[model samples]
Target: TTPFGKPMLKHFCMNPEYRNLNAPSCGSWPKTVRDQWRRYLDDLEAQPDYFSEVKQGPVIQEARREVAQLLHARVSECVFISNATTGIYTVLHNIPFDKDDVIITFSTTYGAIDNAIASMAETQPFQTRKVTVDLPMRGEDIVARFEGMVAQIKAEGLHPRLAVLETIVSIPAIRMPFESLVQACQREGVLSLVDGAHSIGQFSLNLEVLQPDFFIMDCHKWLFVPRPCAALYVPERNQHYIRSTIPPSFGFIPRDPALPLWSKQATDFETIFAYVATSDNMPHMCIPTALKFRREVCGGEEAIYQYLRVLAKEGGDRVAAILGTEVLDEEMRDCGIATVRLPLAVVGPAVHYLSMTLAETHKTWLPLIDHGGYIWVRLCAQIYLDTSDFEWIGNVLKEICET
Candidate 1:
């Protein structure tokens, strides 16, 4: 709903009739999502004994394999995690690091992942060398800047071990030139790890041509799947090196009843899953349903990708106009997510303030985020969002910042 169609205010918020510019904390979902989820819950309630019969049973490996095939990766390469952040942290933990080793990433990354690097830095003997992007650049320049960081490191006589990059930056909402970055990392003799968490439902991905050493994404985000469902992809050669982020449990299926040691890693895929992913895993199981909902009703991947691109640009225009601010219009950064640079120095607090105020006071939703030294308020701008959401948020910012 928007100014055009009754302003879909109450679609996900408490106050349905709200016409205020207040959407910057969470994403909006379609109406059918609740109905479908309720149906799934009803089915679960009717089959309590059925669920008990196979509580700790394996992931629908075949279904996961189907997903892997969709991504153009082999079945064995795809692994499950709670979300993309886990994928990043797990690989970050596994990388062979010394006091001098380093992993490189850009400024426009998800702050949570940036925080992940900070937490890792506390105990690990490594450095997270960050490259900040000054908006409004083409894809090649972005790629070059990334390579330049590695070049600078090598020039300083430091051997960079890993280059952590993002396919779509979470805060600025700009898609990076992932292909050239991969080539640059290879040339520099570095392993490239990609954060593709915002990529799944919004884009048509073909991992067959663009396989990095490691990549991670979530089904919950744009895929519109259930919460806490995500996957990690690691190239085959790197499998032995990947340790369990959370230790696995496997004594229940031992051959001998009197066995002294519990099974830690005897091909039980649960270790690859959440490690303890065995709660009511309805969300993970329903990924296929989510995909169907997005693809079938949303007019397939190609249609949705193109549509969102247009919508995102328009949203960015609206926000930019109201704030009298700037946004990147580079074709290379084509995810079409809208980002409004906030001038506030203490971005984290300002964002939290905006998110809380929008949700509690106005009963609207949007994802306000800050990256690198630049603080930005943003919206994901997927198929579910309409123009009014963007226009309203723009006006809200105008009121608050007095711009």
Candidate 2:
């Protein structure tokens, strides 16, 4: 097994001249996975019907089986979707909501999913209640706030039907105490839907032990899959609730109980997501290749996890030191991502200008956001990056901030 640093860049398809300090935004796939993806795409074009009807099902099932093993979930409970956003939409859209039903989320919820919840409230009978989360806060405090929100909702004579939690919050790129939050939801009889977009490759997950009502993670973001592929896990117990897909495709069963059911391949949940209007599903098929690369070339999942966590901390600290700033609290820096405050004050367009300058001139990209009245940048540590790369970006940011 090779070491985790520039030595590992040979396995990936990224340009050596470019520094990808934002792996959580969109992950890069290894060359081997790209080869596998291309092969599947070519095969589909060679004989569309032959591959779709006969070969695709088995290959997809194989991918699902591998993902299920990694997640410690039953194969029947896992399926593939385009991305995490779609997975959240599918679950939230399908579950029946009663009038005055409340869906609980945090202030740090991803913007797109937050908007989805807002859109649902506009038309659906349910409404959303957000638990305010101030940054630099401890994990235990977040869980306590969530529990209090659930209690407050119930006290107000509203049903706290579900809560949305993240394995890692984006924007600020902080690790969340999702396990405790899941338990809190369970204790309160509120369903838990986890947005684990950054979880799968970054953390060692055991879904069986941390069973939530619904969970979804994007393979493309951290698992080294191609663009736009995610795994959605809905346990058999909750499958009945997901009666339709996001667009209500062919696999959808009619809402009317009197209608006779058609021939089914798998459970309603699996079959419904089996073929969702059919785009290039080649990304989903690359799951096995990604796992293989991680296990053999990357020296297994634990090695990658440990290296990323350590590098993110050290690199983040280095960048913070360079800018004469500080990294976020220790609790939030436990994952492969780190958040560092910038020396500049929060100016809406200046943040965008700095980010663009980094991308266009420096040939590197890091996500910058305005939070807590300061400008912060989210840095990601991947197998191909080391502290030296962090040092280089630090100097670049230092120069940029000075002017």
Candidate 3:
């Protein structure tokens, strides 16, 4: 039987020569995505004036609405960026930070985003603090740790400006208590920036409820969209805070004449991002189709989320048992991805090299991630994966550990 009993969906052109357990890095496209992409381009080709300013404006606005509807966010509150990294940068670069301001994040935060915050602090004198939360932690424990950190920062007489957090930490794949933490930040008078790259499809989300000051998500990560497309949600209340886009867009006002340069006004927020200079619309336009693929192919978002969560918990324990180590997370703590400790014999850079060798020679692709003096192999439970696939991975690890 085909995976998930879906007919012929395995032919989606994701390079089947390897066992792909790397969805946390990037996801494979569904056959529907592959089919609809060509149709989108062909229809675009049929319209000579589609790229024209007047014609392009309304179509893109409608597309943005489609994306917002899919995310359950208000159409006026969100805009598309290149990816989650760029989305985070758009927030950091534009938000006013000073020497006395302190930014809070987790030790397990994504590296590139950590670097982005550091880079911003380099130009200014703000402090960047990474709060550490123990693994195998519960949601309430995570929230308490964050609240304590907020108090700690305030005790030092430092203003806690923002908190950059992820729903799923990339290394060990522990699901952080982001919703409660966002509420904590709100109560503490600090703005929140949620790095939700692994969040959209992994969790059933409602942006209005959590109410972060800024939020960013990558459709490419789990939504089966093409690469480099992400959405940044800036609530209408916070819209005026963003001064300009990185490299400063043309200040193109949508459905109206182009505003003259130096016109940095709240009204320009939507228009400025609508066209950030001649990039391919395919990445952004592919979202609605991606949502359709999720609904029809994967039996909708909730089904996919529940399956991956359960699969990750069980598969993670199985892999850990095979390797003779502890599971990184409990069932409640899992969110589709988990990390198993590598055999003690595989240490340091050797683990990284082994991962590369596995991809190159053994036709197995997985991530060997390092955190807190230990190395782990992150296995993602995606739609294409089954318990048998988990067994194959376990058997492979056993062989690697012995030899």
Candidate 4:
């Protein structure tokens, strides 16, 4: 059964030339999730107005409340943005860095952010410093390695004005220990922005426990919201110091004095600012619907996570064995995003293997990543996968690699 305890339908990838086995490039949308999405779309079309009954209230506020509940954050403190990348861009652009100001990042950062920092360096007066976290870290060393980077930044007088950290790495699918890292950043007063792109939906996130000055996560990536969905969260106190990289919207604009929440103030309005001039928020307006759908699946969050975890464990083991590679051991793995090395994409063999063979032949849609110029296929175990499917994946890889 799928996460919703309903039969998996042969909806997508059923063309005559293709087998029903093929998964989507971005991952399959669950039936119940899709159904909830339909409701969201319908509601959006029918209403076509402000999302909540409360008009002109803070978008960041509502998203903050919802996500904060999941993460245990103070509703007022955590701010929302479109996606983690926007949050990352805000830091890249705004963090009070002066000429020669230094920032550090990892090699495995989402490629788009890497390009942003590189391009920003050309225009901004800041300098970029990079650290490589070669993946599949074993033991507790992952925590210490990050701490050591901070220690080095301290000792070198790099001053470490800015750091783009991850609750989990974007690629190689590693969940580094954030418990120690967050505390260490606090001791040094170093500003840290967390890229939680894959975190919010996969696991129970407690922001009260894991405090970074700024953090961003996407409901779409793992929450299974359709594309164009993400949330940027900032602490309430820091709102005054930072603004959305984009300008302000009526979100921050003052309204009538008689308004119910009139006494309320928005520390920053730039977040929703970019959207005011644009028309049609239907795609994003469907978020609450998606959130509600995910909540209904497999009872609630607890069962959903437990079911997916087991599926991930099973798929990770089977796929690694078939492909003749290794992945994060079952103990260190997070959710279903276990990864293993594959041939480099620059070499072009891996992509050819997935696109031409995996899709054209087997009809699966797993993703691959290039780590420090080496390529690896990362398999995410979802509610849709099972032992037979993973074993089939293994067999396909074995055949591909042997030839």
- Write down the TM-score of every candidate: 0.79, 0.95, 0.88, 0.80
Question: What tens digits encode model 2's per-residue C-alpha lDDT throughout 108-154?
Answer: 99999889988888888788889999898999999999988888899
Query: Between prediction 1 and prediction 4, which has the larger TM-score?
Result: 4
lDDT of 4 by residue, 42-68 (tens): 765677564433332444345556776
> Which 10 consecutive positions of candidate 3 have the poorest summed lDDT?
1-10
lDDT of 3 by residue, 187-213 (tens): 999998998888877768888678788
Task: Name the best candidate (by lDDT).
Answer: 2
Residue 288 CA displacement from its true place in model 2, Å: 0.6
Q: Which tens-of-lDDT digit does each residue in 76-191 have in candidate 1? A: 78877777777888887766687777778787667887897888889887887888786667889888888788888878878789888888766556778887888888788899
lDDT of 4 at 132: 59
Stronger candidate by TM-score (1 vs 2): 2
Q: What is the lDDT of candidate 3?
A: 0.75
Residue 219, candidate 1: Cα error in Å is 1.3
Instruction: Mark the regions of model 3 whose C-alpha exceeds 4 Å error after superposition.
Output: 1-8, 42-63, 252-266, 330-334, 345-349
lDDT of each: 0.66, 0.87, 0.75, 0.60
lDDT of 2: 0.87
Number of colliding residue pairs in each model: 6, 0, 0, 8
